[PDB]
Ligand binder design. Structure first.
Ligand SMILES: CCCCCCCCCCCCC/C=C\[C@H](O)[C@H](N)CO
Ligand SMILES: *C(=O)CCCCCCCCCCCCC
Ligand SMILES: *C(=O)CCCCCCCCCCCCC
Lengths: 60, 283, 5, 268, 268, 60, 5
């Protein structure tokens, strides 16, 4: 049941990996994976009904 | 598939321009922010960008234990006008300010909660004497369960409430709890009341606090020293640290700009001037 | 057994 | 468009009602989410919902307010502002539970010689601060819920010193967005600006937002509408200009659960 | 049925409401037509209809009346009797036009030692006769429309002789079915009889009936419910027996057109 | 001898698993798996000799 | 070795 993932290596001395085994039945007991996703800011930065083309007039 | 630790976009080289394309001109009335990058208004070189937003992911921004309370207990002889001191605390992140302000960048959240307990003790009286190593009981009592009235009453039996028996001087205690909310997310703000005042009812009867939902939202932690008392007095404190793991957040908000004043959004007179003097044309 | 990420 | 279609010229039609505008600054869909009915996979009350559709999802116009050089700002709460609006209000008071989205259309025209700019903000859970420094969280239901008349912002915090008969109302200071955070940051909430030289209206399409799929409309407001003068009204050299501001709001995809006898609230 | 199903034992469920009966005499569907929504090929107003569905199509119980040896009979009009019933009534007063079918359930239990028989008639366009021999067609809107309390029949015609202040009410004589035709023939209208030895209820499912697809519910009643003692109440040897009669009625497939502000009628 | 099972994940940050190895010969020393079954309440809620059909008369 | 549930 071991999960093997890669580290993003900062300062250096191949891919270096690390291992993780969950010891408990409840997912709430798990550590945080930090393997997170990013999304585009559009829902906050461009919430307009008509798609904005930046080279065009915003008002036409 | 774009991950938090991916490098941000490269700068592409761009040269001189003379056209009807107008990136610089915009209209903020629309409610949109102009999506510009340097190559839209100046000449740029090609840069291979290596920086990433890994440390500002919602998880990473919150991945720290914060102190939410200090509980005081003692191990004194109970005497007719004063009993051995045990502590009772209503679980909340709003008794302190730092984690509260971070969570309040958002309206709603979901997370698994990690609680870590740091326990420190001292002698309060002058005398020489001693105490032997203390064991502490941290009992969670959820809304509805009997809250302890005395350090030694039947409720500390804990047949169903979760308790931690912590030994002094050992590693700080720690447990995790899942997302336990009765809603699909925790509400950092509730613009409403828990009661509708009806006309056919007295005002007192329909009244309730603004912005408050369940009166005992999450229950209490009750803490005691399990040991019987020593001749010498020992006071202890339990510091509680909360870390939100596996977190999701919704609807961003401007951060708190004036001092907190209670569990709600209220502010105190005399604290409403966050900003300082600085002249318009002074760097 | 093992999972690789 | 070479057929003439413009970002500035829109028509919105809901139920038996139509709004036209010839000086819009596009329109906003909050968080990019259009209103929707409650999905079976997210459903919670099990009884058949009522969905009044055109009878409630139509444009209701509230009382017109007046913008002057001394105006500090206005606020409304949803669904509170619509509690007395036709069959929407009826459906709201007859049911324990209700959910709804909204199209908010703020109207304010002037002239090419007037100037000023209104920030129009839709805030999820717009909790406002109270008038008291003797008791926190004390604003009464009656004062928290003005209905269609709404409330106003003030440039000055002033604590209620009557302890015998507390006012129990909000005291929402404008640069602190009525809630202890700086107004300059309110742009992270879904918004538009009515800048008189550019446009004469704001249009915000709001989804139902809550930490629940459905809730008590009578106990809880989901959205707050805050309108503040970011740049003050001004005209020619008149010392006392005035132009009106009208709010027209339409519920969208609203559904209700838990039918009983009608709620009769204590509103005064 | 060998699993026990009976003609006498029924359950009706509409919206959040259920009626049970253990002593039914089957149930009637007027003219063999179940209620239906208005079809596109028969449609007339072009605006989107509202169809409140469970919020209005549910069982409403009216005020209980009392049957005694002196009772001559009772009447109600639909939709009038339901004009103040929850969201059905609201939808009715908010719209110019409305159409609806109904399930009518009349309730009256007694004992194996009581006797009597109520004729329960659903009459399309139940025009009743007035109290006047000085002016015909003079019953006022207020007296023609009692709402849920209904009216009663009388065994005696008595002409209003006040010419200064006419009563302007109906004077519906029982053996003349309140309308100048013989009661013994009312059985050509959809009916059931509550004969106390046999059954304790009547159930009539009424389609919308009219010479139009849709009409003004406020100006016009489509159906009349007439309940008359065909055989008088009797019990043991008591001189003054009483048993209650309760009316529960549910609108079915109701839809409304022509939304405006609410109608506020002069009912007194 | 490792037993690999899945967690039912509540709040989220594939299937997440956890691992379990029994360290002792006596099953009494083992932790509780919490992998339990449900049954229908009938032996308590409908202990009648003749099967009940809910739409039918309970007494016929 | 391993068992999977
Ligand atoms: C043996 C010790 C067990 C301790 C168990 C604590 C369980 C209760 C956790 C409550 C979760 C609190 C989360 C924070 C607060 C709320 O999110 C805000 N008021 C918003 O609703
Ligand atoms: C998958 O996990 C199979 C490989 C097992 C590797 C060694 C496990 C090390 C000890 C795990 C203890 C589990 C805690 C309950
Ligand atoms: C099955 O168990 C084969 C795999 C072994 C995995 C590593 C075991 C970790 C240490 C086990 C100690 C056993 C305790 C007596």
């Amino acid at each position: 049941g071991a999960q093997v993932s890669s580290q993003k290596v900062g300062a250096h001395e191949s891919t270096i990996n690390y291992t993780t085994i969950n010891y408990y039945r409840d997912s709430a007991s798990n550590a945080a994976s930090k393997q997170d996703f990013s999304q585009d800011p559009s829902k906050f930065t461009e919430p307009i009904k008509d798609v904005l083309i930046k080279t065009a007039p915003m008002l036409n | 598939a774009a991950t938090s630790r991916d490098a941000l976009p490269n700068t592409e080289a761009s040269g001189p321009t003379h056209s009807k394309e107008i990136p610089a001109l915009t209209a903020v009335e629309t409610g949109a922010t102009n999506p510009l990058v340097p190559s839209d208004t100046v000449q740029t070189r090609h840069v291979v960008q290596h920086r990433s937003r890994s440390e500002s992911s919602i998880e990473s921004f919150f991945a720290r234990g914060a102190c939410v309370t200090i509980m005081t207990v003692d191990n004194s002889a109970s005497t007719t006008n004063k009993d051995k001191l045990f502590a009772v605390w209503k679980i909340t992140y709003k008794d302190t300010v730092q984690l509260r302000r971070k969570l309040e960048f958002f309206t709603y959240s979901r997370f698994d909660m990690e609680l870590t307990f740091v326990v420190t003790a001292n002698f309060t009286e002058t005398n020489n004497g001693h105490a032997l190593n203390q064991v502490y009981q941290i009992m969670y009592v959820p809304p509805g369960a009997p809250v302890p009235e005395k350090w030694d009453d039947y409720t500390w039996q804990t047949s169903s409430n979760p308790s931690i028996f912590y030994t002094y001087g050992t590693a700080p205690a720690r447990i995790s709890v899942p997302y336990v909310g009765i809603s699909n997310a925790y509400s950092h703000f509730y613009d409403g009341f828990s009661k509708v005042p009806l006309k056919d009812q007295s005002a007192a009867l329909g009244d309730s606090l603004y912005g408050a939902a369940s009166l005992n939202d999450f229950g209490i932690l009750a803490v005691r020293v399990v040991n019987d008392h020593n001749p010498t007095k020992v006071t202890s404190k339990i510091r509680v640290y909360l870390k939100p793991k596996h977190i999701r957040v919704w609807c961003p908000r401007p951060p708190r700009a004036v001092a907190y004043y209670g569990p709600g959004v209220d502010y105190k007179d005399g604290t409403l001037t966050p900003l300082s003097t600085k002249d318009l044309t002074t760097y | 057994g093992s999972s690789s990420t | 468009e070479a057929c003439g279609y413009s970002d500035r010229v829109l028509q919105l039609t809901l139920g038996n009602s139509t709004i036209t505008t010839q000086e819009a600054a596009n329109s906003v869909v909050a968080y990019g989410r259009w209103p929707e009915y409650l999905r079976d996979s997210e459903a919670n009350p099990v009884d058949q919902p009522t969905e009044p559709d055109v009878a409630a999802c139509r444009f209701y116009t509230l009382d017109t307010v007046s913008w002057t050089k001394e105006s500090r700002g206005w606020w409304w709460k949803l669904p509170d502002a619509l509690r007395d609006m036709g069959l929407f209000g009826q459906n709201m008071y007859y049911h324990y539970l209700g959910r709804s989205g909204y199209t908010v259309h703020v109207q304010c025209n002037a002239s090419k010689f007037h100037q000023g700019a209104l920030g129009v903000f839709a805030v999820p859970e717009m909790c406002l601060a109270g008038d008291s420094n003797t008791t926190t969280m004390y604003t009464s239901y009656q004062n928290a819920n003005p209905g269609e008349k709404g409330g106003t912002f003030t440039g000055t915090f002033t604590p209620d010193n009557n302890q015998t008969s507390p006012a129990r109302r909000f005291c929402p200071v404008d640069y602190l967005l009525g809630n202890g955070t700086l107004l300059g940051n309110a742009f992270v909430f879904p918004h538009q600006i009515i800048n008189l030289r550019t446009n004469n209206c704001a249009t915000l399409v709001l989804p139902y937002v809550n930490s629940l799929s459905i809730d008590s409309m009578v106990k809880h407001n989901n959205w707050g509408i805050a309108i503040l003068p970011l740049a003050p009204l001004n005209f020619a050299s008149e010392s006392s200009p005035e132009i009106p501001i009208t709010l027209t709001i339409a519920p969208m995809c609203c559904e209700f659960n838990g039918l009983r006898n009608i709620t009769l609230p204590r509103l005064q």
